[PDB]
Design a protein around this ligand. Structure first.
Ligand code: SAH
Ligand code: PT
Ligand code: PT
Ligand code: PT
Ligand code: PT
Ligand code: PT
Lengths: 265, 265
């Protein structure tokens, strides 16, 4: 008589925790959503196969409007699981869904999974040095979001790193690339001139974490902005002040210029 | 031919990903360390039974001083696995090990798993609002660290949440508790009088993340400082100004005082 929030992990269907896989198997109903992120290494088919259940996929509307009409009821009698890419509660508004469940008399449990928020550790940057985070959103119409630019600025002054989730348009099937994100920030630099993001700023790009051969590249915008990083999902990082060892990792593992090694202490 | 960095997850043996188990089982040699953190929900015996291989445990010294002599050699002619709690490379000194693997001419691949960094999402706080992270260290000798206090100050100032790791004596098997951590912050407040951590400060305590029954509690320090949060590990969080939705989750889920709806929002 419970409902389960089970993460699916970063890349393919095997990125799920054993615990999550065994609970999903003994589940009466299985729902899922694939609009919060992109699992570029699998297919609903491979997932259903690994689970041994038919998975009913929900849209953002079904969830943000009819979660308690579509899913909660079934959990007032059976054992239902809600699957999501990566960690179900990270950089999503799903947490509020738990209150819905509560208010509906349904117990909820969270089975975590590998998230991009911690996967950044593979870039060589210290996870504790990351400051506030932000999302580079696609401008739409005459509306041009810029808040993320200020986030990058704030952290930079404190010497902290910035994690930038790139935008996604699941239904339109649009997945922002690091390049597009780099382009937008340049145009925001022009508008604001805070000297926060420029052709020289060092950036880090992580593509397809969770795959066994992800793309990890570091360098100055001008040198990376026109580079092919492979298929999405992509994630962008604007480092703050580096530690020698962070720099060494970036050069030896991310192909950055042996010059960034000279940290301007 | 390769060396695999595999995360074991947060609490028990089922917290490892499916991909991680398959890879580990097919490996020739399997190493693991348990000094960065401990899996309170399990034992080395259950981990060994699950993988079905003899696991050699390495000391902090073993890794930091002789990783290239104990682990890397075997990866020249075999497929070796290095197990670590959480997500690989989230521990500061861990990323550097990949640089060694390369120089020894060894190819390395990272297999992620849930980390505490992403798992705190279960507190209801928004991930993007987390600032710099810090660790509350036990004073000892003529050494009384207080930097973690400033981290909280600079974060709260900018409306950001502070994730606070508690000190662990991994060999002695002794966990710092949320309570002990609160005591320390009170003594530090009483010394720097910056009005950062007082009896009235709202804090969140997370214990045993990763289990189906973790302890999530929120309230004023004066009301939690002597509450029983169960067995370690404990994580302490000093949230910045709350988003109403956050406040609602902490109340409805973490059983927090209604006060926060008017007070901390
Ligand atoms: N495996 C992966 N590799 C690279 N980027 C990833 C990724 N998974 C998610 N991202 C990035 O994260 C943003 C989507 S936000 C969704 C995050 C997801 N809920 C989680 O917890 O992991 C996009 O920028 C997407 O590219
Ligand atoms: Pt039931
Ligand atoms: Pt497109
Ligand atoms: Pt430069
Ligand atoms: Pt091989
Ligand atoms: Pt103790």
């Amino acid at each position: 008589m419970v409902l389960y929030f089970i993460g699916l992990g970063l890349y393919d269907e095997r990125d799920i925790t054993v615990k999550g896989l065994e609970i999903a198997k003994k589940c009466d109903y299985v729902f899922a959503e694939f609009y919060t992120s992109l699992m570029a290494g699998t297919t609903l088919g491979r997932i259903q196969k690994l689970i041994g259940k038919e998975i009913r996929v929900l849209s953002r509307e079904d969830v943000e409007l009819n979660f308690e009409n579509i899913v909660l009821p079934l959990a007032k009698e059976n054992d239902v699981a809600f699957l999501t890419p990566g960690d179900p509660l990270v950089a999503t508004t799903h947490a509020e869904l738990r209150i819905r469940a509560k208010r509906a008399g349904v117990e909820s449990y969270v089975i975590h999974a590998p998230s991009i928020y911690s996967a950044v550790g593979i870039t060589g940057l210290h996870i504790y040095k990351f400051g506030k985070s932000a999302t580079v959103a696609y401008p739409e119409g005459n509306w041009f979001p810029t808040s993320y630019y200020d986030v990058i600025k704030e952290n930079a002054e404190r010497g902290l790193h910035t994690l930038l989730f790139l935008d996604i348009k699941a239904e339109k099937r649009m997945y922002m690339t690091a390049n597009e994100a780099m382009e937008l920030l340049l145009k925001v630099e022009d508008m604001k001139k805070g000297g926060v993001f420029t052709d020289d700023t060092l950036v880090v790009v992580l593509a397809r974490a969770g795959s066994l051969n992800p793309t990890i590249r570091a360098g100055m915008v001008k040198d990376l902005i026109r580079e092919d990083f492979g298929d999405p999902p992509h994630i962008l990082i604007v480092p703050g002040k580096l530690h020698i060892v962070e720099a060494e990792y970036l050069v030896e593992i991310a192909g950055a210029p042996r010059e960034i090694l000279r940290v301007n202490v």
